[PDB]
Structures are given as C-alpha cells and as structure tokens.
C-alpha cells in the first residue's frame, strides 16, 4: 500500500534504500493515523461511544445492559446535580454521540 | 508557508506548477487533520471531553432513581432493573476518552 502512495507523490512531483524505506515508513505512519481516525468515526457511527451531549431539561434513563460481556453495563443517561440546579439527566443518543457533543459544544 | 517547507523536505528525502499547488493543498489537508487530532487530545487532557466509563457491576446502587439524582459530579448511568434505582459512576475528568478506550481495548 505505501508503494502506491509513494508512486503517487513522486508523480505529483514529476508527473539510498534506507531513506526510501524511511519515506515508506512515514507514509505507513500517516496511513495508520488515517486508519485510527476512520476507526473512531466508524465506532461512533455504530453508536458505542457514550459521549453524553452537554454544554437543559430532563430525559429518560433506560435499563442497564452489558456490551460484549464483562459484567460492565453500558450507560444510558448522563446525570448532573449541582448544589442548586435541581439536576438533569439527558440520554446518550444511539446516533453519533461524539459528533453531536462536538457540535452542540462548538455552537456556543 | 508551512506546506512549501513540508514538500521541500519531502523532495530532499526524495533527492538524497499546478502539481505543486495540489501537493501543497494535500499537505495542508493532512496537517489540518493532524492539528484537529492534537486539538482533540488537548481537549481530552484539559478535561472538556466527557466520555462515559462503562458502569462497574459492583456498583452499590443509589437510594433512588436517577431523576432524584441522589448520591454531584456529571456522572452518567442507567436504571438498574434490580431495585429501580440507578447505578452511577462519575466521568473521569483527566482522560475520559482515553480511559474509556483503554477499558474498551482491555476487553
């Protein structure tokens, strides 16, 4: 895979072996970073990234279910009680929870 | 300024006009992606990235449902069918995304 990217780059430029291997390794590192971010996006798409959207009103807290075994229960709502807020509980969406948190964070 | 330096470094590695513009643009896109990744890491470290840790089974369970919010830090949790109360765990301030992903990889 890195060979194709290297060929593409040298073509864009013009459309010893140790440093060529170094370029290939940097290309592989870039591909790994892109793969990691794509994996994060896919996991958020499948909705097992429990980023509760904050930053009003209440919401439902559903039952506790364990994901892929482990005796640990996937959270269903995000609850906060300041000393004078009366406390609010907002459900974590099954849609892009991380993306929605980022959006309704960057809005303000 | 940075994209020209980056492609010049790549050329130096290689050698021991529209194409140049396209190369600079793709370098700009890659560095912007890296910059956003670093921004996410910075936000996670500062603590402004609530990611919910998986609730331990050993949770003692509260004395009432979540809406009562009885024992508060911005925890996240779910209602336990055992006694109608909900078992809540605070969001780790330090590294929430990182800690949650570490727990996910541990299983």
């Amino acid at each position, epitope marked *: 895979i890195p060979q194709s990217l290297d060929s593409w780059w040298t073509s864009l430029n013009f459309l010893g072996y140790r440093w060529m291997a170094l370029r290939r390794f940097i290309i592989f590192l870039f591909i790994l970073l892109l793969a990691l971010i794509f994996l994060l996006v896919l996991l958020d798409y499948q909705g097992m990234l429990p980023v509760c959207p904050l930053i009003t009103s209440t919401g*439902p807290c559903r*039952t506790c279910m364990t994901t892929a075994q482990g005796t640990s229960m996937y959270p269903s709502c995000c609850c906060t009680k300041p000393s004078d807020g009366n406390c609010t509980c907002i459900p974590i969406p099954s849609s892009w929870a991380f993306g929605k948190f980022l959006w309704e964070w960057a809005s303000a | 300024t940075i994209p020209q330096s980056l492609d010049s470094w790549w050329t130096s590695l290689n050698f021991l006009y529209r194409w140049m513009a396209l190369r600079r643009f793709i370098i700009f896109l890659f560095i912007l992606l890296l910059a956003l990744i670093f921004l996410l890491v910075l936000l996670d470290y500062q603590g402004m990235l609530p990611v919910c840790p998986l609730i331990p089974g050993s949770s003692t369970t509260s004395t*009432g*449902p979540c809406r009562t919010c009885m024992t508060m830090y911005p925890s996240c949790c*779910c*209602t336990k*069918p055992s*006694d*109608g109360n909900c078992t809540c765990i605070p969001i780790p301030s330090s590294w929430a995304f990182g800690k949650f992903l570490w727990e996910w990889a541990s299983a």
Partner: antibody, heavy 119, light 105 residues
C-alpha cells in the same frame, strides 16, 4: 429484536416440579436482564423472578422464595425457571420478559406458558 | 407494599381517561405502565413515569404527583380496550398494580 418462546407447561399434581424454558432467539439476549412474571387465572400480573446477565443476582418474590430457581445459559440463549413443590395457588400463565436497554422496562414479552397445578 | 388501582374505568370513544395508581411515596419511585390484552402478551406502554417505548402511540402519557401516579389516554381508539397495570419497586421486588380494565363503549 428478540423472539421469546416459552414452553414446559402442563398438568401437574401439587408438590410436583416443572422446568419452564424461554428460548430467546438472538445474541442480544445475553445483554438484558430477564424476568418471569405470572398472571394468575382471573387475577392481575404478579412478578415471579428476575435474572441479571450472568446469573450472579437472582431475585424472587416473597411468595416463591426458596421454591423457584431462576437461571439462564448464554451459550444456548435460554432462560429456565425451575419451580419445585408447587402449591395449589401457583396456577398461572408465566411470561418471559426482557429488560431491553432501548426501552427501560419489560418491553419484550413471550407468548406465555399456562401452568396448571391440580388434583 | 400496598399498591392500588381502580377495578375498572370505562369511557366512550374519544374522551380522555386518567387511570389512577395510588401508592404511598410513589412520587419518589418511578412507575411503569403495561397494557395486557386478553390472549396477548403484555405491552410496555410507559416507562420512567412519563416516557413511552418506540412505537407506542403518542396518545398514551404518564404523570406523577405525590403519593399517586396516572396514565392518561387521549383519543381512545377501539383497540385501546385492555387491562392496564402500574408497576413499581417496593425495595428490590417489583410490585404490580391490581390492573384497571379500560373498555371502549
């Protein structure tokens, strides 16, 4: 979602034993709590038993504590309630309910197996 | 735990029924409402006092005020006729209500 089918109901003498089986169809059965809820003939719903994901926590109603044993197996995706030494008042229709995480209550229910203890 | 419902409440089609579910300290607890039809498995109508599962018509709604709860059904259709049970937790055992029979006249 989940298809729950109960079985193992029929005529039995008092003091006998029955093994009611809920054969949930789907791997997602493994994640939810399950429960057996009995509707007595001509009476209202009555809770019988509740089981968590692994079986560490088994809860019964005071009427049946020490007589019924709720259990589940995840390899076969089945929930078995073993009732021992039934009394004449245990006649009912037993329902297999699942506490789905997307509902917040006993939303998925089974057909309902008619137990009948009689002379 | 004594949890009480009326034996039955019946209305003509169209009106709105407020099924009561009186139990002590019931405001603190959260209440679920199940719809059982003769010959059919119970259907979860309300959870967490005021919330409906996916697919339940918006007609159903829940309420709680002190030592009592209520299931409000608006625009009662000919299918709604059923039995309705309110369920809560005493401490760790779930207690169901007596169940009210709603009949569509």
């Amino acid at each position: 979602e989940l298809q729950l089918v109960e079985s193992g109901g029929g005529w039995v003498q008092p003091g006998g034993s029955q093994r009611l089986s809920c054969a949930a169809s789907g791997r997602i059965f493994r994640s939810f709590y399950m429960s057996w809820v009995r509707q007595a003939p001509g009476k209202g719903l009555e809770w019988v038993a509740t089981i968590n994901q692994d079986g560490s926590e088994k809860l019964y109603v005071d009427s049946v504590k020490g007589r019924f044993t709720i259990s589940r197996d995840n390899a076969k995706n089945s929930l078995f309630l073993q009732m021992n030494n039934l009394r004449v008042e245990d006649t009912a229709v037993y329902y297999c309910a699942a506490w789905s995480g997307n509902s917040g209550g006993m939303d998925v229910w089974g057909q309902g197996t008619t137990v009948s203890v009689s002379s | 735990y004594e949890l009480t419902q009326p034996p039955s409440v019946s209305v003509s089609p169209g009106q709105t029924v407020s099924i009561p579910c009186s139990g002590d300290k019931l405001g603190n607890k959260n209440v679920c409402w199940f719809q059982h039809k003769p010959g059919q498995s119970p259907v979860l109508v309300i959870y967490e006092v005021k919330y409906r599962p996916s697919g339940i018509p918006e007609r159903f709604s829940g309420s709680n005020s002190g030592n009592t709860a209520t299931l409000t059904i608006s625009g009662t259709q000919a299918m709604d006729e059923a039995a309705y049970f309110c369920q809560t937790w005493d401490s760790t055992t779930v207690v169901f209500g007596g169940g009210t029979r709603l009949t569509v006249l």
